[PDB]
Amino acid sequence: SRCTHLENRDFVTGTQGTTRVTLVLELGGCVTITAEGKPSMDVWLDAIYQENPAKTREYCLHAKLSDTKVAARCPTMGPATLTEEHQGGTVCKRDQSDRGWGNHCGLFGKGSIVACVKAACEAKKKATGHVYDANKIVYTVKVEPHTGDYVAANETHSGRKTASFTVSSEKTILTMGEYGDVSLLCRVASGVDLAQTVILELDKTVEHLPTAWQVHRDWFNDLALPWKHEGAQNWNNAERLVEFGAPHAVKMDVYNLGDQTGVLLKALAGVPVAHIEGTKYHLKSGHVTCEVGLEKLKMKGLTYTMCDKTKFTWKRAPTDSGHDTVVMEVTFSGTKPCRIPVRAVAHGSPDVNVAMLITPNPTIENNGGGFIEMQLPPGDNIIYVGELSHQWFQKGSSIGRVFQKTKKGIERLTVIGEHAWDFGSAGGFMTSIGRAMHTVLGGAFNTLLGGVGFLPKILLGVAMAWLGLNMRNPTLSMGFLLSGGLVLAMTLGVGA
Amino acid sequence: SRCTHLENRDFVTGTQGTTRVTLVLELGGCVTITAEGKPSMDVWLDAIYQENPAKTREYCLHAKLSDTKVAARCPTMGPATLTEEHQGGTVCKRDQSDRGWGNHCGLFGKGSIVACVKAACEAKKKATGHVYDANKIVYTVKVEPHTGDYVAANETHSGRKTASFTVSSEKTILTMGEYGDVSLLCRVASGVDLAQTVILELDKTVEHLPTAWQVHRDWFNDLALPWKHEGAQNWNNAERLVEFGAPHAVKMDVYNLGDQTGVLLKALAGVPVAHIEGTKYHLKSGHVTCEVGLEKLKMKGLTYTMCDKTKFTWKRAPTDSGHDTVVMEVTFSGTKPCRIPVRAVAHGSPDVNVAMLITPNPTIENNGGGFIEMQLPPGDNIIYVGELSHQWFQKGSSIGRVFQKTKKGIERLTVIGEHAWDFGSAGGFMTSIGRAMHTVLGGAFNTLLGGVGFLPKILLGVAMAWLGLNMRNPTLSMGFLLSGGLVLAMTLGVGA
Amino acid sequence: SRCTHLENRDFVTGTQGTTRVTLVLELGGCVTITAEGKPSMDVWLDAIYQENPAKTREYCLHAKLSDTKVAARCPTMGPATLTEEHQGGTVCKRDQSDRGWGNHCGLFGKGSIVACVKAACEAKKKATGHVYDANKIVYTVKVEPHTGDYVAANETHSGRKTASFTVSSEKTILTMGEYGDVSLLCRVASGVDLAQTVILELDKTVEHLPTAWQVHRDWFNDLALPWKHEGAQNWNNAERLVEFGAPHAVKMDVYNLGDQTGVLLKALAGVPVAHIEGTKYHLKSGHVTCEVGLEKLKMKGLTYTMCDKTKFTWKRAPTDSGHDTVVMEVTFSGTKPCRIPVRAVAHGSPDVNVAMLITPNPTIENNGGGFIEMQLPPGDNIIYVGELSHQWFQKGSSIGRVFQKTKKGIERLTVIGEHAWDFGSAGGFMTSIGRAMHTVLGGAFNTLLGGVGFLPKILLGVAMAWLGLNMRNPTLSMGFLLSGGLVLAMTLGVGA
Amino acid sequence: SVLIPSHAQGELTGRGHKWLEGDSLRTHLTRVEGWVWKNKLLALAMVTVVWLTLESVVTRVAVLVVLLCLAPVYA
Amino acid sequence: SVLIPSHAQGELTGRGHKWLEGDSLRTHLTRVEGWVWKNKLLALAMVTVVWLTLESVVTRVAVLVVLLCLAPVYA
Amino acid sequence: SVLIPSHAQGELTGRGHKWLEGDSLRTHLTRVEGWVWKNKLLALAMVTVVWLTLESVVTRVAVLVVLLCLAPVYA
């Protein structure tokens, strides 16, 4: 199970007779779905990508300057003039120099001087924005069954099957081997908002930088650099990287503002990273909402004999997964295809097997098997596999389990926003008021405050609350107290 | 008369009894001495420099990284360590990877990972500080006698004399041919503060930047960058150009924050430029208090014959200098060594001469002569040179000239500060009141608000005055209105 | 009868229908079980150990220093720098020495000096910490039947049986010879908290110290000494045992703070001892909870005939055990095997036998037997073995017995904590309340004040009582008096 | 990360070429005006709410300038 | 090429690797101590003029607690 | 077993080297300034119980200096 490899594991379960479950799948997440009398199944989103997305603006990070010229005119000889003021790709300034007999004029006073320089970009110094097309995005959802066997992060599990999704191809059926068939519906609408998201590329060749950043479109439109669209030979606003010295007699200096006078470091701090792999432009932070059908699934080996109880040995003695579960592996010797007689018991009444098996109906097959995952009540238990027996102490308490499940819940809200309500083995009427309140309040907070920094959002919230205390009208006072407290709480919503 | 070439010129008047004058000579300025019965002198400060100043810190603006290495150990198997972790010229991070059975560990929990990378500066990307030595600095002062001869800003006056002053130099004399001698003293301890001043050098060969900048020492000594002193092989500050990605199970990626030249050049906005010329490091803003003595000066040619009034012809007709003076050049056809009969008349009253000459006792000599400069009262005038005449309308007013000297005083007092009271042909008791009150009231502002920025100085000054309108006693209200007004008055001049 | 050799002994009782007893067994403790009509047993914990526990930190108690080197620079000549600053196994400091003409410098002022020395540990001067693995600990429990023969301490008894418990065990069954089988189950988790204990080793070859100490883990992580983990050659924090002299012009002393062994042995005052034996690492404090089942035990010698009442003689006369029991031994000359007619009586009635025997159905064997232990009521008594008669006077009283049995219970509660409620052969309602109150109120005290020093805890308790007397609110006043008393009682119950 | 705070503007003696004219009123005034052109809905809400809530013209003027000049500064 | 704004901390989805971290109040409140502990000096006493100016303990504490996160934040 | 109390600053050769310079005033002030940043939350309980129970600013200040001087003597 690939689900054991990640810290960000999740579990959701189908009740008696429930044939369908709705999931939200995320690039850094993994869901084990279990339902009564169906094989346990792991589902995750492995990629979101497009090939060769459309270029938008190119921006210049380091100007090259060349072929500077100047012209100047004596007092009352009228304004100085150059051919280069009319061309493309030149930056120029027109200014006045003090003149007199000492610099070969006939009168003392102010002359006129004009200075020019060609502007270009250095060989690999461009920031490029690329934008996704909803008609060509590929999502990629993968499924793995609990085959009762174990694999590393760097091993090829034969039970993994893959399904690509795009707007022309929302549904697919996968054959999981002897475990039967599974049905996936992915809406490729919803998910990442491709209208707001730009993929920013600097230079793929650099040894010690990530290949791209996942930048917001309203920020990217405001970069105060020189800029162009693709194919153009001349740069808009090239004066934004050139400054002109104070004029002296018949000469005037031209200066750069310097190498990498642009986007890297302190501007992009906190932006998600993205990755470029040949033609593919992957996001590396994002999601899809997906419905899984559990009708056509089968459980292997319900016809097998149980093991001869004496003939086991441990291959991996019990350990704690970190997900509030116990994992273990057994070796066996004897008649090959068999059920494993697994159970566990507390210091209460001994007839009660307390183990919830996460691997349903575990087996040893001819080639492999004998891994088990299970969940237990808090406190002191003994775990059994035939005549192998091993004491176990389970951490936490019935209250501690709930506080952890609540924190995971709040975190999914703070990451996903309103789509978080679609995660569940149910879709009952209370989900509609949940999404309705989240749609209104989320839209309101985004509309007013979407570009405001963390600190000024807190200052606004404190101002609203303090004005609410100072207001003489009780209706306005209470509205300012409620809205100020909410603005503070949902500003602070960056974690749990 | 070199002091006509600059936009900036001053006049000091030596009435009889003035054998010596005190000046504060400045780079980017010139002073003319007009002494009663003695030749007029041009005097100015021409360079402040040292050959090969001492290096202080070198900083690196762009990191080169190589040979990255990583090592990790399983949970409870003890912390990871690697041979480069104790060498010079390496950056390292110690961190806690999450590990478990999927990543080849025996247990699920936090492990240990260590990452290493070498660091160097790219070949041209340094910033080098240099510092002056008061025992080796050279100040250069020049003098030029009013020979009545005009040569352009790009050619050499024969009568121009140089004095080069160090801490070794006493009162020094310059022999000016027939005009006599000028005797001159420069006070090296009464000029630039060499403790607080640093010269900053990036790369000299960059074609479109100035060759050096002048910076304050208590800014240069606390930049957040990698630093070194000359000839050392390794960089000596906990690395600020290198950064470490969040750890995977068995890998951790190193990042380079790239070239800082653009953020440095932005942070230097507002500093004076400097210059480097071979081995010589020049300041291009600065001053020295200097004392000039006149008892050894003579008017040339006071025994010479008068000219033939009829034999003059113009070579360059009367025009305005921009300094409220009239300038001209004349030619003579008679026997050359003689005194020119210059005079000027208010239109309609030929009895009174109104020519205040700046060239005392004008002459023609066999090798050259005939430049004249004078100041005339506003309105209609006639200018004469023998039987030549020209009619001149002098622009301005008596009020406009008093306003111009007022403005020029406030400018020098703003730029040069406390030393500006020492400028003049006098030292009477009022000057001690001025310099004392400037030292105390200006010293209070410099002590309390030194290093506070322009905007926050304005906000604090305005707030202190505005709160001053509503304080709990009229003594405090007045005191905080007065001190708030003083803070704004100092700030809105140049106290940024 | 091993329970007679020891200063600590507990007695447990039960009716025919009890079948199972729950015990807490302790190192240096001992339990005798006296269920109705069953052969009595002694049970004790003999050892808690692991072979070769894993090393945590090593610490150095005596720094060895060698090959010191020093380098220094004149004022304004930059920092001093030396090769040994960038190696493993060196410790260094830099400082500003005073310089001038008298030590070959051109300027008077603060120079720069760096001093370096190599650091190591002397040959046997380490402390090593060791930690247990819960999967490898062995607990050894021993059982002995009351066979009616006496074997001394420091000689071997044939009837003793050994059970070795590790995390992979359930119930075990020991065949106690002709007395049938005893069934025993150990909970290997809980009681001792193996995550909080470090076995500390200094040097096993020293003749006059314990081989190891049972130190607390939170204390051992905070030792301010040089440290490393196994197999590394360099020491971390070596600057904890070198301290440097004030600098001279071109020299600076290195001083060694010497062997710390004595300071550590003083800091460990009040920590229990531990023992090392070849590969074994024993604790000499700790406890385990066991359930022991009596159902398969057989009474020996119920079929045999009575002894001849006339043929006994004493071997050990009736003597006080110190455990409120009488101990005696008899020799017999009749036919064997046979049953000893033993009884005891009080002067108030010659018919009523008042002997509460500990040895059930005592016998003479063909090659052993003849020892009896019994409890008698307070007052004046006669003990009979056939025609042997011996007077007795039993010390103490019924109220004195109730006190000593209550006192010994408080010793379990203070030494063992919440596990004190598990000790017993039968249930009762107040044991459910007592465990709840102890785990709640003791949990609160350990949460809020746990690690705080003894005198500070008293001062805080006395301050709480002072606040209770002085604060004007009567509800807060009584709450401070009640809570201050509880804090003081639990504090005085652990001491210093 | 590298930080290089701007040099204090008035501390050095003038009358020669300075590298650039300082941030002064120019950079501040254009930064404040540019923020009002972007966060239009919030800027209009802030000025109208302050104008409808605070009890004098002088305390309104003070709060309006403070809230404007400290809003865009975090870069 | 000046006044590139710092990217907003909101609306971009998380749960994968970011480039660096910063600009929340948890970080930003710590930045200004490096000015207050060395440059502010005599002006650290301005807590007294704010305290003596405003009307009551609850208003003095409220204005000081907010001023400490914005008033020294001039750059 | 053996205990050796280190002696006061009575003997003072005025111009010669000390051994380890355990000069108590500046050292204990440094220890107090460390303790109030490491154990920072506990100062709130100590100041509030004094502020609530003692009836004047004079008697509050008189104990608080002594209490904060005593704080690092215990753990």
Residue numbers in the entry:
A (entry chain B), B (entry chain A), C (entry chain C): 1 to 496
D (entry chain D), E (entry chain E), F (entry chain F): 1 to 75
From the publication, what sentences describe this entry?
The E protein is a class II fusion protein and the largest of the structural proteins. It is the main protein responsible for receptor binding and fusion, as well as the major target for neutralizing antibodies.
We thoroughly characterized a chimeric virus containing the prM and ectodomain of E (ecto-E) proteins of TBEV in a LGTV genetic background. We determined the structures of LGTV and chimeric LGTVT:prME using cryogenic electron microscopy (cryo-EM) and three-dimensional image reconstruction. There are three occurrences of M in the asymmetric unit. In one of these three, we modeled two alternative conformations for residues 25–74 of LGTVT:prME. The observed attenuation might also be due to sub-optimal interactions between the prM protein from TBEV and the C protein or transmembrane domain of the E protein of LGTV.
